[PDB]
Every structure is written in C-alpha cells, then in structure tokens.
Design a protein around this motif. Sequence first.
Motif, short mmCIF file in Angstrom:
data_model
loop_
_atom_site.label_atom_id
_atom_site.label_comp_id
_atom_site.label_asym_id
_atom_site.label_seq_id
_atom_site.Cartn_x
_atom_site.Cartn_y
_atom_site.Cartn_z
N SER A 14 -10.39 17.66 -13.11
CA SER A 14 -10.32 18.72 -14.11
C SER A 14 -11.20 18.45 -15.35
CB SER A 14 -8.86 18.95 -14.51
OG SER A 14 -8.74 20.12 -15.28
N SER A 15 -12.51 18.50 -15.16
CA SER A 15 -13.49 18.28 -16.23
C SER A 15 -14.85 18.81 -15.76
CB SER A 15 -13.56 16.78 -16.60
OG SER A 15 -14.19 16.02 -15.58
N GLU A 16 -15.90 18.50 -16.52
CA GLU A 16 -17.27 18.88 -16.13
C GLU A 16 -17.68 18.17 -14.83
OE1 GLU A 16 -19.09 20.72 -19.24
OE2 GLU A 16 -19.30 21.75 -17.30
N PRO A 17 -18.23 18.91 -13.84
CA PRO A 17 -18.73 18.33 -12.57
C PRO A 17 -19.72 17.18 -12.72
CG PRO A 17 -18.63 20.70 -12.37
CD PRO A 17 -18.21 20.39 -13.78
N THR A 18 -20.61 17.28 -13.72
CA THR A 18 -21.59 16.21 -14.06
C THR A 18 -20.92 14.85 -14.35
OG1 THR A 18 -21.63 16.95 -16.41
CG2 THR A 18 -23.38 17.79 -14.97
N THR A 19 -19.73 14.89 -14.95
CA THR A 19 -18.98 13.72 -15.43
C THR A 19 -18.00 13.13 -14.39
OG1 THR A 19 -17.04 14.90 -16.34
CG2 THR A 19 -19.02 14.80 -17.75
N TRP A 20 -18.10 13.55 -13.13
CA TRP A 20 -17.27 12.98 -12.07
C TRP A 20 -17.83 11.63 -11.68
CZ3 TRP A 20 -16.89 17.74 -8.31
CH2 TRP A 20 -16.19 18.76 -8.97
N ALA A 21 -17.17 10.58 -12.16
CA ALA A 21 -17.64 9.23 -11.91
C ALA A 21 -16.52 8.22 -12.09
CB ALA A 21 -18.79 8.89 -12.84
N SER A 22 -16.70 7.07 -11.46
CA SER A 22 -15.76 5.96 -11.57
C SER A 22 -16.46 4.73 -12.13
CB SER A 22 -15.12 5.63 -10.23
OG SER A 22 -13.90 6.33 -10.10
N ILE A 23 -15.78 4.08 -13.05
CA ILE A 23 -16.28 2.90 -13.69
C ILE A 23 -15.56 1.77 -12.99
CG2 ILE A 23 -16.15 1.57 -15.81
CD1 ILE A 23 -16.44 4.43 -17.25
N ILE A 24 -16.31 0.90 -12.31
CA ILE A 24 -15.70 -0.21 -11.59
C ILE A 24 -16.36 -1.55 -11.97
CG2 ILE A 24 -15.92 1.47 -9.68
CD1 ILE A 24 -18.11 -0.54 -9.49
#
Length: 330
Positions: A14-24
């Motif tokens: 539930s946010s901007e599609p561009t910002t779909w990411a995981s920090i690992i």
Amino acid sequence: MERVLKVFHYFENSSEPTTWASIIRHGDATDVRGIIQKIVDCHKVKNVACYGLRLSHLQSEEVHWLHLDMGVSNVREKFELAHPPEEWKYELRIRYLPKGFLNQFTEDKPTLNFFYQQVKNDYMLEIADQVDQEIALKLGCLEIRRSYGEMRGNALEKKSNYEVLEKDVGLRRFFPKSLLDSVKAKTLRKLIQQTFRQFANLNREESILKFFEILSPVYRFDKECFKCALGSSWIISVELAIGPEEGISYLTDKGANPTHLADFNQVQTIQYSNSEDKDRKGMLQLKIAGAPEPLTVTAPSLTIAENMADLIDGYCRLVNGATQSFIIRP
C-alpha cells in the motif's frame, strides 16, 4: 562484518509502486540465491525457482543478471569499482517460467501478482505509448478493475467516482501519457466508462489473466531473444529464443514459429568464456544429451553470454528439481 542492500521487487504494498523494495543485510558468505530466498519467503512464494536478480546501471541500458551461486559481496564489489552504489539498481524479477506458467501461478497468488506487476511495469515503460488506443484503454481498465476489486460494476458511470481517478489518484497510474494527451478529458471519460463496462464483472484473477491475454499478441513477456551465432567452426547467425514453450530455439520468419533445438532437461552442462582468441565476443557452450556435438553459441559480448548462461542455468534448475548449478566453473 556485513552490508545493507536495497532490492526492488513487485510484491504489492500500500504505497507508490516505484518504492516496492526490501532492505536486506548480507554478509560475506551470502550468495544471490540467499537474497532471493530470503525475500520470497517473507511473501509466502511457492515457485521459488522462477525468481532471479537483475542488476541495472541507472544511467546506461546495460543489464546484468546475477547468478544464483555468486556471492553478493563479491559481485557488488566488482560492479562498485565501475560506478558508485547509488547508480546501481538491484531488482528481484521472475525470469524462469514453467510450462503453463500462467495457469500454474494461479495456485500461487503472490507470484501471479508479482509477475503481473513486473510485466505491467515493463509495458508502461517500453510500449504503452505506441500500442493501439483500444489496447491501452483495455489494459488500464483491467488494472482499475483489479485494483478496485470491491467496487461495483457501474461505479464509473457516476461522474464523482471517475473524478476521483482523474483528480485524486491520477489516470497516469493506468494509462500512457500519449493516450491521455490526445483525446479530451470528457471524451476520455466516455471511453474509459464504456471500455471498463466489458470487464466490470471480472474478479482479480480473471482481470490479471485477461490482461496477459490482451498484452501477449502485442508484447513479448514469455521468452527472451538473443541475436548471436551457432557453430564451432562454421558460424551461423541466428536469433535464439529461450523460454518455457520452446526451450532453446531459433527464429526464422516474421510470423513463423521458432524452430526447436533442445529442451532444458537435456542440457548437461553450461560453460562460458570471452571469445577464445583476439576479440571481445562471448562464447557459450552447452553439452546436450542426445546430440553428438555440443551447442557452441557466439554472443556479441561476454555480458550477453553471462546473461544467457544465467537464463539457461536458471531453467535447468527449474526443469530438474535442482539447486546445484549447471554451469562449469574453474
């Protein structure tokens, strides 16, 4: 000790599609398979073997698929010599499709959605501005339908509901700008209302599947093609097609189907080096069960050969039950 890596992906949030990411976090023993597994596990993926990791330089168009066996720290260090960290983009992607992939992903919603988002993102970026108006309308309406999955069937006949899409959300999330910039706000409304009508009844799955059905005649998302050359002494130029339906194949005419060379389950080994002479081409060689001579491919660069090697190897893992690589190293 360890380092942090941003990895973009297409698991909806539930946010901007561009910002779909995981920090690992990743140590110096972590490999690419590790990263992928880590991320897909969070989202309850069943088809783990379909996913790969693609590195892009944000400036240039060059693209490097990172091999599953490769260490993260090793590979990151190599690319960070060329250009600094902010210019690289690591994104998780579905690359290795099973036969009947759409029908299969139906039993694995996270993946079906991931694939849908990945492909819709590629559509919007590459060809939406030059596809037919009727197609650009349909594909956008289907996303509305899927996205507002609870909404009534005629809810867009009510001006005020269409207005929310126009003004608050923005029609840019569904349709290409070329489409929006031609046609008047008031004629576009009547086109969207009317087009959506034929998909009003569809649920989220039917929507996603219909999307693909409509997209596939005009945009390829079910295989990758490489212009390269076959043979170990007499070299012949071809365009290889590598994908689920065709395995390893080569193109001939516009309109005619790929000619089959070999299925992935026959591939015994994979090896690649840079042109074995004075050149900058990339050699790729396959041992194949059934054929006498191995399949010697000559690609235009080592980078392309590296990328072809990943694709084939990824499919070999998939088609067998494997977690071992099928790439011979030193």
